[PDB]
Subunit: 157 residues, 2 copies
């Protein structure tokens, strides 16, 4: 089972969903994420183009690759913030941005914020000529999708 | 308007098409590719998952991101080979890999080869747990789509 972090958000050209479920094993194991055994769960950000995404050239529903996605978790009652760097990966059901996560502050209700940066100038381009190009341009400040009352009560699996 | 490089190829889990048309302006201008004015044409590699791609977790027909695509162009009867690193980008028709290029030995018949490497070790992962993961793996030797008799007969525009 997948469990929602909250209701899907539309922000700019992106439709953004968040879900969590059991920790997974990834190859290669990304960055500094906890192993399947060490982690509390896996959290994924599903990011697909919405209608406004067409101005950048995307088809509506297309996965949007080359983004840099980071999550920030803050337990209600705490001033501590945990930063989670998501990584691009495929599961059985396709390309996602995801991470194994261990909640440093434990059980409780959290504010969960996804900050989504556009592809680096070095890593992606847009056709901009009249004939073949697109009208839109990538966003400069990261797009934000946030849920304010995410309840972490331990594994639901 | 797009012109064909040759017949579409299926290689491993990828369906690969090659087209060319007038040089384009890109933002930012990628790597060391020629400008719109300096180039002879823009060449695109259109790469989507085929049925064998479903084992890697891709939706069949999905664009396959994070690949490293390099084109080699060699005029018939010549020992000179041009190496062109393609860049990921969007045009009005969506994400693809491509480049502005010059045909450096002028008009005539060229061998055109796309070598397609899987994502860098640190750029992508697969879920591999039995529960959420996939049973396929990335290819180790780059995949090759090639056309032995592409005719560069100059701008068709
Ligand atoms: Co939705
Ligand atoms: Co939407
Ligand atoms: Co999903
Ligand atoms: Co994942
Ligand atoms: Co820019
Ligand atoms: Co292009
Ligand atoms: Co590997």
């Amino acid at each position: 089972d997948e469990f929602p972090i909250g209701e899907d958000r539309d922000v700019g050209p992106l439709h953004v969903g968040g879900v969590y479920f059991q920790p997974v094993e990834m190859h290669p194991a990304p960055g500094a994420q906890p192993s399947k055994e060490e982690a509390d769960c896996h959290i994924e950000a599903d990011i697909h183009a919405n209608e406004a995404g067409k101005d950048l050239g995307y088809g509506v529903g297309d996965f949007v690759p080359y983004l840099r996605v980071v999550a920030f978790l803050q337990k209600h009652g705490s001033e501590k913030v945990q930063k989670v760097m998501f990584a691009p990966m495929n599961a059985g059901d396709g390309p996602h941005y995801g991470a194994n996560v261990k909640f440093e502050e434990g059980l409780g209700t959290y504010k969960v914020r996804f900050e989504i940066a556009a592809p680096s100038h070095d890593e992606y381009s847009l056709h901009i000529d009249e004939q073949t190009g697109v009208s839109g341009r990538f966003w400069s400040e990261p797009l934000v999708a946030e849920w304010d009352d995410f309840e972490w009560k331990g594994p639901q699996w």
